[PDB]
Enzyme design. Sequence first.
Site, PDB file in Angstrom:
ATOM      1  N   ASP A  38       0.816  -1.211   0.000  1.00  0.00           N
ATOM      2  CA  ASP A  38       0.000   0.000   0.000  1.00  0.00           C
ATOM      3  C   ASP A  38       0.858   1.273   0.000  1.00  0.00           C
ATOM      4  O   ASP A  38       1.816   1.366  -0.752  1.00  0.00           O
ATOM      5  CB  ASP A  38      -0.950  -0.029   1.203  1.00  0.00           C
ATOM      6  CG  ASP A  38      -2.219   0.780   0.967  1.00  0.00           C
ATOM      7  OD1 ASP A  38      -2.160   2.013   1.070  1.00  0.00           O
ATOM      8  OD2 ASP A  38      -3.275   0.183   0.658  1.00  0.00           O
ATOM      9  N   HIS A  72      -3.346   4.926   4.733  1.00  0.00           N
ATOM     10  CA  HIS A  72      -4.146   3.728   4.483  1.00  0.00           C
ATOM     11  C   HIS A  72      -3.419   2.437   4.875  1.00  0.00           C
ATOM     12  O   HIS A  72      -4.026   1.531   5.454  1.00  0.00           O
ATOM     13  CB  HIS A  72      -4.568   3.665   3.012  1.00  0.00           C
ATOM     14  CG  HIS A  72      -5.630   2.645   2.742  1.00  0.00           C
ATOM     15  ND1 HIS A  72      -5.366   1.447   2.112  1.00  0.00           N
ATOM     16  CD2 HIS A  72      -6.954   2.636   3.028  1.00  0.00           C
ATOM     17  CE1 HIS A  72      -6.483   0.747   2.014  1.00  0.00           C
ATOM     18  NE2 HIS A  72      -7.463   1.445   2.564  1.00  0.00           N
ATOM     19  N   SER A  90     -11.509  -2.095   0.995  1.00  0.00           N
ATOM     20  CA  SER A  90     -10.087  -2.195   1.300  1.00  0.00           C
ATOM     21  C   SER A  90      -9.844  -2.469   2.790  1.00  0.00           C
ATOM     22  O   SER A  90      -8.742  -2.836   3.173  1.00  0.00           O
ATOM     23  CB  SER A  90      -9.345  -0.924   0.865  1.00  0.00           C
ATOM     24  OG  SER A  90      -9.650   0.151   1.732  1.00  0.00           O
TER      25      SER A  90
END
Length: 473
Positions: free
Chosen positions: A45, A86, A260
Amino acid sequence: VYQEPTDPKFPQQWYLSGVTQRDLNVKAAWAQGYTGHGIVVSILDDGIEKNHPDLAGNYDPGASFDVNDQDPDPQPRYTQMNDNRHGTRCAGEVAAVANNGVCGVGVAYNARIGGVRMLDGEVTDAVEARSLGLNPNHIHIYSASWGPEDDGKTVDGPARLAEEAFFRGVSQGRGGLGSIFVWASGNGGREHDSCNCDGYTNSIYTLSISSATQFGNVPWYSEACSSTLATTYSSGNQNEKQIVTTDLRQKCTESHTGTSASAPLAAGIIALTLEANKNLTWRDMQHLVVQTSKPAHLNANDWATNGVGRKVSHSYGYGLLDAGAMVALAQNWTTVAPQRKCIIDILTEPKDIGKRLEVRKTVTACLGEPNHITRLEHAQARLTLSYNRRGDLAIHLVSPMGTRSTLLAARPHDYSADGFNDWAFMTTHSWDEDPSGEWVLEIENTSEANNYGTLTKFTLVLYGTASGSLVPR
Ligand SMILES: [Ca+2]
Ligand SMILES: [Ca+2]
Ligand SMILES: [Ca+2]
Ligand SMILES: [Cl-]
Ligand code: NA
Ligand code: NA
Ligand code: NA
Ligand code: NA
Ligand code: NA
Ligand code: NA
Ligand code: NA
Ligand code: NA
């Protein structure tokens, strides 16, 4: 004897443990003594805050790299907008430390956790490949949610280096047992996206996961497709709770959202399962998910029973992951036979699509040959076709056992005239079925427009084995 975590936000982690029966049954796994010890998970990520007070204790530099800046340190790039938060959020879902008075806990709170910083920059085929291929004899499980834009008009998948990384991973990764690639199926629900158009989640090499809201509904952001295997909880409307995890700048968030956030929870459950049986292959793991996942209390209008009696939905796959059931079944699991591949070229001539095209073909599934399959895993319809407006097409595939898979739903925003170029639409919905007999491909124009095009190639590709079936459910 088992004492559940005392972390301050653990009671807010409704999806882990609740008295409601609306959870992932993770406490049952923990009580069996599986918390992820010895397993290594990497988040692919935007980086990982390796010094976060709820991650530092489990952080593994061997599961980490910075592909964007080409250095070993995946620390996120800090900005005012906190854009690069994230990966840290996802890492905490998997492996946030337990019983340390900070935030909540990971699903696998004794696993080791790393991150690859690879989204914070230009994401090329090479960047993807080096991330997927990172330290594959050290990392067990990879978790990712990237891929083509969820605008409901894109068709894209891994290019050559990334596809090569997938095959090297499942073939030689983890001592030959195969890297486990866990993927989120997409966030394009608002754009009416259809996730088989995303070649990353549509891959057989990725174990694809969708979302359910707290009240058991299909969230606004969800994409339906036949390639999805299973579901974990995530966010929904503003009366429903969300995901609780580690956040950037050493904080805790209670508002992690979207598909996600589902994939990392699945990766954590898969880590517990791998602790219960380290000898599981990448294909073993997908079998376990198919056999143990639970439809109960997930609401969808498309639940169907397949040929071996399992309920399956295009929104949910085989249903909610069940950690307790996964680790129980893993312990004495018998390794599946080597994967066979039966290639069937269906057409003898190109076929006009027009308003509707139906192609019927009776197959023997390589009868008499070493690739004979009586027990299906993944099936692909690899299609090459032209059409003037791609999103007006809906495509279905019916197995000999009568299981109707949606390969492609109408995508109102997809105005492309580029058609499909050997696109391998994949379905998991006929898993464990005998694929001998009549297959039916249906292509239809869902609009009133006078559209036109031609199907020029239809390859039915069957994967699976010829042994070890269970009595149908
Ligand atoms: Ca760095
Ligand atoms: Ca904690
Ligand atoms: Ca998508
Ligand atoms: Cl192959
Ligand atoms: Na690309
Ligand atoms: Na492409
Ligand atoms: Na691509
Ligand atoms: Na192998
Ligand atoms: Na997949
Ligand atoms: Na059926
Ligand atoms: Na048959
Ligand atoms: Na028939």
